[PDB]
Amino acid sequence: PSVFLFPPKPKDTLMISRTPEVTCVVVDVSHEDPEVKFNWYVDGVEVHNAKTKPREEQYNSTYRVVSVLTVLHQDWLNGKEYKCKVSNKALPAPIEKTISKAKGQPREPQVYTLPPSREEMTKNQVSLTCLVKGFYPSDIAVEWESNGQPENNYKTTPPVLDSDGSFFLYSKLTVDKSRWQQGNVFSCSVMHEALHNHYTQKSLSLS
Amino acid sequence: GGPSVFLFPPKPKDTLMISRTPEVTCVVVDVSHEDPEVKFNWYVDGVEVHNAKTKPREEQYNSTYRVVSVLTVLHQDWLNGKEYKCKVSNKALPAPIEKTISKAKGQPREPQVYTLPPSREEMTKNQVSLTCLVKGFYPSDIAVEWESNGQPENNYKTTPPVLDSDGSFFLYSKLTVDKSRWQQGNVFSCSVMHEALHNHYTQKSLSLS
Ligand SMILES: *[C@@H]1O[C@H](CO[C@@H]2O[C@@H](C)[C@@H](O)[C@@H](O)[C@@H]2O)[C@@H](O[C@@H]2O[C@H](CO)[C@@H](O[C@@H]3O[C@H](CO[C@H]4O[C@H](CO)[C@@H](O)[C@H](O)[C@@H]4O[C@@H]4O[C@H](CO)[C@@H](O[C@@H]5O[C@H](CO[C@]6(C(=O)O)C[C@H](O)[C@@H](NC(C)=O)[C@H]([C@H](O)[C@H](O)CO)O6)[C@H](O)[C@H](O)[C@H]5O)[C@H](O)[C@H]4NC(C)=O)[C@@H](O)[C@H](O[C@H]4O[C@H](CO)[C@@H](O)[C@H](O)[C@@H]4O[C@@H]4O[C@H](CO)[C@@H](O)[C@H](O)[C@H]4NC(C)=O)[C@@H]3O)[C@H](O)[C@H]2NC(C)=O)[C@H](O)[C@H]1NC(C)=O
Ligand SMILES: *[C@@H]1O[C@H](CO[C@@H]2O[C@@H](C)[C@@H](O)[C@@H](O)[C@@H]2O)[C@@H](O[C@@H]2O[C@H](CO)[C@@H](O[C@@H]3O[C@H](CO[C@H]4O[C@H](CO)[C@@H](O)[C@H](O)[C@@H]4O[C@@H]4O[C@H](CO)[C@@H](O[C@@H]5O[C@H](CO)[C@H](O)[C@H](O)[C@H]5O)[C@H](O)[C@H]4NC(C)=O)[C@@H](O)[C@H](O[C@H]4O[C@H](CO)[C@@H](O)[C@H](O)[C@@H]4O[C@@H]4O[C@H](CO)[C@@H](O[C@@H]5O[C@H](CO)[C@H](O)[C@H](O)[C@H]5O)[C@H](O)[C@H]4NC(C)=O)[C@@H]3O)[C@H](O)[C@H]2NC(C)=O)[C@H](O)[C@H]1NC(C)=O
Ligand SMILES: [Cl-]
Ligand SMILES: [Cl-]
Numbered sequence: 001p002s003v004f005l006f007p008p009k010p011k012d013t014l015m016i017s018r019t020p021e022v023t024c025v026v027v028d029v030s031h032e033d034p035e036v037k038f039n040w041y042v043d044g045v046e047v048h049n050a051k052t053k054p055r056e057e058q059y060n061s062t063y064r065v066v067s068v069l070t071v072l073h074q075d076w077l078n079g080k081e082y083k084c085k086v087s088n089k090a091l092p093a094p095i096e097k098t099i100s101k102a103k104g105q106p107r108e109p110q111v112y113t114l115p116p117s118r119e120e121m122t123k124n125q126v127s128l129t130c131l132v133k134g135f136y137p138s139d140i141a142v143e144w145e146s147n148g149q150p151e152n153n154y155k156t157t158p159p160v161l162d163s164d165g166s167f168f169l170y171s172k173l174t175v176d177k178s179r180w181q182q183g184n185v186f187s188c189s190v191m192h193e194a195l196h197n198h199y200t201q202k203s204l205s206l207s
Numbered sequence: 208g209g210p211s212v213f214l215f216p217p218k219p220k221d222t223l224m225i226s227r228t229p230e231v232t233c234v235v236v237d238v239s240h241e242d243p244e245v246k247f248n249w250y251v252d253g254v255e256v257h258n259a260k261t262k263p264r265e266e267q268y269n270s271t272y273r274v275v276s277v278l279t280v281l282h283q284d285w286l287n288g289k290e291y292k293c294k295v296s297n298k299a300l301p302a303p304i305e306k307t308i309s310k311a312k313g314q315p316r317e318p319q320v321y322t323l324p325p326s327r328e329e330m331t332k333n334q335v336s337l338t339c340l341v342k343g344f345y346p347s348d349i350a351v352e353w354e355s356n357g358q359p360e361n362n363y364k365t366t367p368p369v370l371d372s373d374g375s376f377f378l379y380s381k382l383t384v385d386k387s388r389w390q391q392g393n394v395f396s397c398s399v400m401h402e403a404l405h406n407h408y409t410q411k412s413l414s415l416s
Pocket of ligand 3 (some may be wrong): 073
């Protein structure tokens, strides 16, 4: 059997009202040795409050069993290490995977808005650009708003590693030219552990 | 419990630069001790070719063999959509396994390239960012660089292609320069190589004011 261990979603870690979870997944579990025992550790100390999910096997030969551990906000953000230890009779010894937040001094993103280029103005639809740079770790969420409303015609690049070891990305919002024209305000919001209140916002409007 | 085959395309830049060597790579994993022998046959639009470079078997740390065969593809053949087939034979298989690969099938689309200058807020910094937006392209194979004067500017990073809502791709490239240099009206240029551009190449420029 094989073990994979997944982190929580960026927003879940940053918002006190949401529930950050770590997920331990076991695949390739045999019918002859189907029994699968999970032990979880938080910086080496065993915890007993994981919620094991029912096994679901479509469609190939084995089965994957997933155990979900809720993590404390402060613990994840302080870099504690979550260990999933999986025991099964088909293994030589128990398998152990360990996950945490990336290690090192957090760095605050700088956020800049850029308007469409002149050449793009000749088009029917235009692109509003949000540059987010200098952040560490790479865990981040970006969204767009207009008129106190979520704008959803955006796509965001994955984080890219910069030369100093920090990260950058860009988010592009697509809007009708005529709408950009007439001076509506559009906003780029960023959630990241190093921002004050884990949140900042920048705005962009026709000049 | 048998061997598995994976077939990889060439790197985007290799397909676009005449001076580089585009290769297709056929990889076989989970080859046992009891049936260690793997045989490769390669086909280019169904016609067998005999000039792949096959490597010796290598024992992996998990106690199976990995065996790889590399076929060089002609630039024009890959770009014209020829289909490369790797057929793998091994005694532990019921029948030979076949994988086929070619360039992506959709309607090609020419990238639109736009340059964007630093934001005002960034101007207060020591170093500023020049941004190149490349969008609307298909397929995703592309290469981007920066120049100032004739010469290659090398303080840039580029995002991978991202899938847009219309099924085409976009990316951004960021060039980092000293504020004082941007100031004084130097020209910087963003160049893009893509199969759908005329001469597979276009260039845009950016300057202060
Ligand atoms: C048998 O079979 C099996 C199964 O299979 C399947 O099926 C089949 C039939 C077919 O189809 C196939 O295809 C499939 O697959 C199999 O299995 C397999 O296995 C394999 C191997 O063996 C593996 O692999 C691995 O993977 C990984 C990844 O993955 C991912 O992704 C994918 C996609 O594709 C998927 O699928 C998966 O699953 C995953 O996913 C994930 O998951 C997770 C967990 O859970 C998560 O997390 C989480 O999340 C959550 C969420 O939540 C929610 C949401 O969403 O929101 C909530 C809510 O409430 C709800 N909603 C509603 C509305 O309701 C939701 C719900 O629930 C639903 O969803 C809806 O529907 O939910 C939360 O948030 C939490 O908190 C968290 O935690 C996530 O999200 C996901 N994602 C996605 C995208 O999806 C990977 O990773 C890997 O890789 C790695 O490793 C490797 C080796 O191993 C290498 O090579 C690579 O490279 C990597 O590495 C790495 O790297 C890194 C860096 O980068 C580092 O760090 C590390 O360390 C490394 N490592 C090492 C070196 O080692 C691989 O690839 C897989 O997975 C599997 N699959 C599955 C599916 O499972 C088997 O195999 C068979 N057998 C045989 C063949 O023999
Ligand atoms: C044992 O071992 C072995 C080995 O391993 C090793 O060692 C060990 C001991 C350890 O240590 C580890 O860690 C190491 O590694 C193993 O093996 C393995 O196996 C596996 C299986 O199981 C596999 O997997 C696969 O993978 C893939 C990917 O791969 C890649 O990546 C990775 C990371 O991620 C890496 O690792 C690898 O290596 C690879 O890489 C690559 O490579 C290549 C070659 O080399 C390259 O290329 C090249 O390059 C050069 C330079 O250098 C030149 O340039 C040339 O030109 C070229 O060619 C590249 O670059 C690289 N990359 C990177 C680095 O990045 C993946 O993909 C896969 O996946 C798939 O499949 C699966 C199944 O199985 C699934 O599940 C998934 O999902 C997928 O699926 C797919 O999907 C897709 C999409 O998404 C699709 O497609 C589609 O289609 C449609 C139609 O239908 C349309 O067309 C569309 O459009 C499209 O898109 C498809 O369909 C699908 N498919 C299928 C389903 O099939 C997989 O995952 C791996 O790979 C391996 N490894 C190796 C190394 O080999 C074994 O396993 C063991 N065993 C035991 C028992 O344990
Ligand atoms: Cl908490
Ligand atoms: Cl050639």
